[PDB]
Design a protein around this ligand. Structure first.
Ligand SMILES: OC[C@H]1O[C@@](CO)(O[C@H]2O[C@H](CO)[C@@H](O)[C@H](O)[C@H]2O)[C@@H](O)[C@@H]1O
Ligand SMILES: OC[C@H]1O[C@@](CO)(O[C@H]2O[C@H](CO)[C@@H](O)[C@H](O)[C@H]2O)[C@@H](O)[C@@H]1O
Ligand code: CA
Length: 223
C-alpha cells in the first residue's frame, strides 16, 4: 500500500497473509474454512496466516493453517488477468474471535463513488522495495467504468473495476495482490493489477467480486 496508514492492530480481522516461505499475497476470510484471493497468486503449497498484524514478529494471536485445496477460476487468463480469483480451503477451520472474523460477500455491485477500505502488506514505495511489517490501510473510491477504461484502453473487462485516485499518490502495490477491497461491510474487490503503483492516471485494477458470488457459493458447497 502506497500512501496509506498503519491499520490499528487487528482492526481488519478478515485479512490474511499467504505465505510460501515469505509473505507473497493477501486474501480475505469469507467463512471459517475458506479464503478468497487472486488466481495470479497461485502456488502449489500455501500457508494461510490469520490474526496477523506484524508479520515479522510472533505476537500470540496468529493462526497458521495450511491450504488443503486451491481452486482457481476455470476461466482465469494469465495474460489479461481476466477472472483473477481463487479459493483456498483451509486444512482445519479457523477459530473465530475478536482478531479473526469473516467478511460478507456482496449483495449488489458497488456504485462509482463508493468509499472502500483496501489493506495489505505490499510495497509502500512505488518503485522501491520497502515491504512493511505492519498491516497498511487505504481509503479509496470506486471509479466509473469510463474513467477506468480511459486509463487502461483495451485492457478492462466486465470483471474488473478501478478503485483509487487519478491524480496518483495512493494505491495498492506488489505484495497486496489477492487482498480485500471492502465497501460498506462487503467484499467488492480483490487486489489484481495496475501499471506501476500510485502513478498518475493509472489507478489500481481489482477483480469485480460481485460477478462471482454464485461461483464462490457453488464451489464451497461442492468441496
Ligand atoms: O512477484 C513478482 C510479480 O508478481 C506480482 C503479481 O504478478 O505481484 C505478486 O508478487 C508479490 C510478491 O511480493 C505478491 O505479494 C503480490 O501478491 C503478487 O501479486 C507482480 O505485481 C510482480 O511484478
Ligand atoms: O503489471 C500490470 C501492468 O501490466 C500491463 C501490461 O503492460 O497490463 C497487462 O498485464 C497485467 C498483468 O498484471 C494484466 O492484468 C493486464 O490485463 C494487461 O494489460 C499494464 O497495462 C499494467 O499496468
Ligand atoms: Ca505476527
Amino acid at each position: 500500500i502506497v500512501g496509506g496508514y498503519t491499520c490499528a492492530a487487528n482492526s481488519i480481522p478478515y485479512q490474511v497473509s499467504l505465505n510460501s516461505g515469505s509473505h507473497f499475497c493477501g486474501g480475505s476470510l469469507i467463512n471459517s474454512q475458506w479464503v478468497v484471493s487472486a488466481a495470479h497468486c497461485y502456488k502449489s503449497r500455501i500457508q494461510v496466516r490469520l490474526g496477523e498484524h506484524n508479520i515479522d514478529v510472533l505476537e500470540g494471536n496468529e493462526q497458521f493453517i495450511n491450504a488443503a485445496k486451491i481452486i482457481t477460476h476455470p476461466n482465469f487468463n494469465g495474460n489479461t488477468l481476466d477472472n483473477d480469483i481463487m479459493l483456498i480451503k483451509l486444512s482445519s477451520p479457523a477459530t473465530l474471535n475478536s482478531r479473526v472474523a469473516t467478511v460478507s460477500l456482496p449483495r449488489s455491485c458497488a456504485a462509482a463513488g463508493t468509499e472502500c477500505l483496501i489493506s495489505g502488506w505490499g510495497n509502500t514505495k512505488s518503485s522501491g522495495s520497502s515491504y512493511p511489517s505492519l498491516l497498511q490501510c487505504l481509503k479509496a473510491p470506486v471509479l466509473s467504468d469510463s474513467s477506468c477504461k480511459s486509463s487502461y484502453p483495451g485492457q478492462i473487462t466486465g470483471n474488473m473495476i478501478c478503485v483509487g485516485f487519478l491524480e496518483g499518490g495512493k494505491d495498492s502495490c506488489q505484495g497486496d495482490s489477492g487482498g480485500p477491497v471492502v465497501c460498506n461491510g462487503q467484499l467488492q474487490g480483490i487486489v489484481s493489477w495496475g501499471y506501476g503503483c500510485a502513478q498518475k492516471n493509472k489507478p489500481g485494477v481489482y477483480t469485480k467480486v460481485c460477478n462471482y458470488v454464485n461461483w464462490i457459493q457453488q464451489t464451497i458447497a461442492a468441496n
